[PDB]
Amino acid sequence: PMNDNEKRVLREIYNHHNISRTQISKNLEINKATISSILNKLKYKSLVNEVGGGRKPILLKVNHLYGYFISLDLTYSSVEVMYNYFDGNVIKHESYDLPDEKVSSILSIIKKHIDIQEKLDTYNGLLGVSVSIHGVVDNEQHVTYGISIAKKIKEITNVPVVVENEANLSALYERNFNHNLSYNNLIALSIHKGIGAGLIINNQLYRGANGEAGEIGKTLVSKVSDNVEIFHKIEDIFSQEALLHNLSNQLNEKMTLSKLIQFYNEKNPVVVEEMEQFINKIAVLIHNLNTQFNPNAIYINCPLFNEMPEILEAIKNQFKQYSRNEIQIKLTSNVKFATLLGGTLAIIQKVLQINDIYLDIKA
Amino acid sequence: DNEKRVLREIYNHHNISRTQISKNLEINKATISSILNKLKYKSLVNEVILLKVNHLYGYFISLDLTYSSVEVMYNYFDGNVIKHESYDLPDEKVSSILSIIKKHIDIQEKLDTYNGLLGVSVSIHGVVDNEQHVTYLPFHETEGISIAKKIKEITNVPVVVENEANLSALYERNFNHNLSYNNLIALSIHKGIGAGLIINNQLYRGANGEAGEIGKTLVSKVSDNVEIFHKIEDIFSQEALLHNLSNQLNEKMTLSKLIQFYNEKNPVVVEEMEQFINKIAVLIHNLNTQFNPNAIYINCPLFNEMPEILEAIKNQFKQYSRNEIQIKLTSNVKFATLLGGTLAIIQKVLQINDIYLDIKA
Ligand SMILES: [K+]
Ligand SMILES: [K+]
Ligand SMILES: [K+]
Ligand SMILES: [K+]
């Protein structure tokens, strides 16, 4: 009957660390008697606990032992497995090598290394699974890029499942990480094999009509050759994979990220020249994203930049040649866990059926 | 605010019964009758069984500051057009705009309404930040003057200032609300390239009011082994097209001359048009991969004069994408911007955020 007000009070508890009963009442404009009644039902269901002059305030927190969630990240070479308490806090994290591209190999890892009957000292055990992918998910949870990998995971685990693009999940993470700065407009820019963007617009993850918003890697740019204008996808020019493939052709050897960093630190001229060009293209890309979306901030997740964070200053310096806008240009706020923790947020929101959980999980 | 909800229902459903309002809002008939009696008492609503927004409560002014004119639209309280006037703009000066406003608008005139002028919307070819500061006005000389403050001082009513493409997107939202297109773009192609963005049924302006300033996107061209970056509005805006045809044909090219030379099948013009159509198709593909809207509404004077070019854009778009995005021309050539302005001032004065009224003239 009071399902909505129970959800509202629970959301306040997630969003405000050790909030008082009276502060919940004030935030929601609901009388103290009704807030006390709602809290008693939430305490009775083991969802919330009380925290251990004049009257002492009653402080509330989410009961981390109510159950746990699993956040999965299906990368190009691994299966990342994160376990989170009901309050979002990290229990443990594991990384498994992915022997090949097969979905069967992913499912084999999930079956072999995840014990779904394990309660991890929680009352209800596994409550839900988030799945992060390097692909496109439509608004009806269909992976569009026999049976979907998410539905295959839903059957193996037998709990609610959410599937989402990795850049979209990282943007949810950045929304909550920078919520204290009120950055209600931001972009999580992903540069790896492709170029992807997680878009936060007016504090909401914007997915577009088909879940393809922020598929910036597919943007077409022209180059006139032999008096013929040819269009190319920007991710075929300056994704990290395109940079490595280009350098493999120029140096006539197989280039890996580790070799690129080594050759760059050694100041190999072919690599230095290509890096200056790559840095310039990314600076122009940030300018273009700013004139299109005009966010408060952009958070770049590029393995090369995470290994050499000083390149952020070269991007910022090159950006100044094109624009005087004060957009915050940053690297990802959490190299290891932004995507995984964004997944934790998405599964919490789905299982609870509560939007705008602003919880900033520190890990 | 149930009083605001009932008023919004009456705006959104022209002639709605007391029982239909009750059903739409899930509020009992007695409370709806009580709310309606207060709204009738305030002269905001009139009876026709059916309820209508009292058009004689007052009126609004919607202004459009174009490159060469000051467009002045008068609207009743229900949004209906009273009249529209167009004044020549002698020069770029903001002082000349204010002189026209002071000379041709009688703010004491009630126009048979009870309260007279209730508010003014101002549409500009430029950037307005979220604090109503005009931060970019390319074809007009500001001279330090605050458009918002100066029009508010002259008219003594609430004033909203907004980008023309943003106002056109607000107009398309109302026009295509029955199709539930909560994500759309109003693409403006004239001297520059601009976009009004509707995201999740709301006008998205960005952190500085610069969202959709797509004309400033930089693209590179290698010349004499040097990579040079250019703003796309300097390459394929309508002005840029006319400029490159002026250099190729060695004569001053106007829109009227372009259409004439195109219909005559002048080879320089026919090839440049095929290239222009292709660049706009790629632009729509790029906007779709960036924003992925339900629909895009293009406002380009060349396309409004030759609407069949929409089919050539749609055909060329299929070479790049299989997406089912609706590609259309503006739903109202003459008044989308002005009527979007009417909507923005109605929403501001009433403090009601999702009004879907669709008048066309
Ligand atoms: K990445
Ligand atoms: K995305
Ligand atoms: K100003
Ligand atoms: K705009």
Written as six digits, the tokens of B340 are: 């979007």
The bound ligand whose nearest atom lies closest to the alpha carbon of A165 is 2
The bound ligand whose nearest atom lies closest to the alpha carbon of A171 is 2
Same domain, A274 and A326: yes
* CA pair distance A170, A150, nearest whole angstrom: 19
Same domain, B153 and B229: no
* CA pair distance B327, B293, nearest whole angstrom: 10
Provide the CA A24 distance to its chain's centre, in angstroms. Answer: 29
* CA pair distance B202, A305, nearest whole angstrom: 35
User: For residue B323, which residues of chain A lie inside 8 Å, CB to CB?
Assistant: 210, 212
Same domain, B90 and B28: no
Same domain, B256 and B238: yes
A65, A85 contact by CB (below 8 A): yes
CATH number at residue B271: 3.30.420.40
The CA A139 to ligand 2 mean position distance, Å, reads 12
User: For residue B222, which residues of chain A lie inside 8 Å, CB to CB?
Assistant: 223
Give the dihedral of Cα atoms B335, B336, B338, B340; nearest 10 deg.
150
Same domain, B226 and B322: yes
Q: Is A284 an interface residue toward B (CB < 8 Å)?
A: yes
Same domain, B61 and B144: yes
The last residue of a domain, from among B35, B54, B73: B54
* Structure determination method: X-ray
In this structure, what DSSP letter does residue B248 have? H
Same domain, A44 and A94: no
Q: State whether A231 and B323 contact (CB < 8 Å).
A: no
Q: Is A350 an interface residue toward B (CB < 8 Å)?
A: no
Same domain, A322 and A300: yes
Same domain, B166 and B125: yes
* CA pair distance B196, B167, nearest whole angstrom: 7
Q: Determine the structural domain holding residue A171 and report its residue range.
A: 64-181+332-363
Same domain, B96 and B187: no
CATH number at residue A23: 1.10.10.10
- Considering its fold, how many domains does chain A have in total? 3
A225-256 b/e with 16+ CB inside 10 Å = b? eeeeeebebbbbbbbbbbbbebbeeebeeebe
B344, B355 contact by CB (below 8 A): no
Header resolution in angstroms = 2.1
Nearest to A322 among B183, B218, B275 (CB): B218
Q: Is B226 an interface residue toward A (CB < 8 Å)?
A: no
Interface size between A and B, measured as CB pairs under 8 A: 94
Number of Cβ atoms within 10 Å of the Cβ of B254: 12
The bound ligand whose nearest atom lies closest to the alpha carbon of A169 is 2
The last residue of a domain, from among A29, A63, A97: A63
Q: Is B194 an interface residue toward A (CB < 8 Å)?
A: no
Q: Is B209 an interface residue toward A (CB < 8 Å)?
A: yes
The shares of helix, strand and coil residues in chain A, as percent rounded to the nearest 5, are 40, 25, 35
> Given CA atoms B191, B193, B199, B203 in this order, what sign does their dihedral have?
negative
User: For residue A201, which residues of chain B lie inside 8 Å, CB to CB?
Assistant: 199-200, 204
The last residue of a domain, from among A63, A89, A114: A63
Distances in Å between the alpha carbon of A2 and those of A5, A41, A43, A235?
Answer: 5, 10, 15, 49
Same domain, A109 and A160: yes
> Do strands A90-97 and A78-85 pair parallel, antiparallel, or not at all (unpaired)?
antiparallel
Residue B185 forms beta bridges with which residues? B197, B296
Same domain, B63 and B131: yes
* CA pair distance A125, A134, nearest whole angstrom: 28
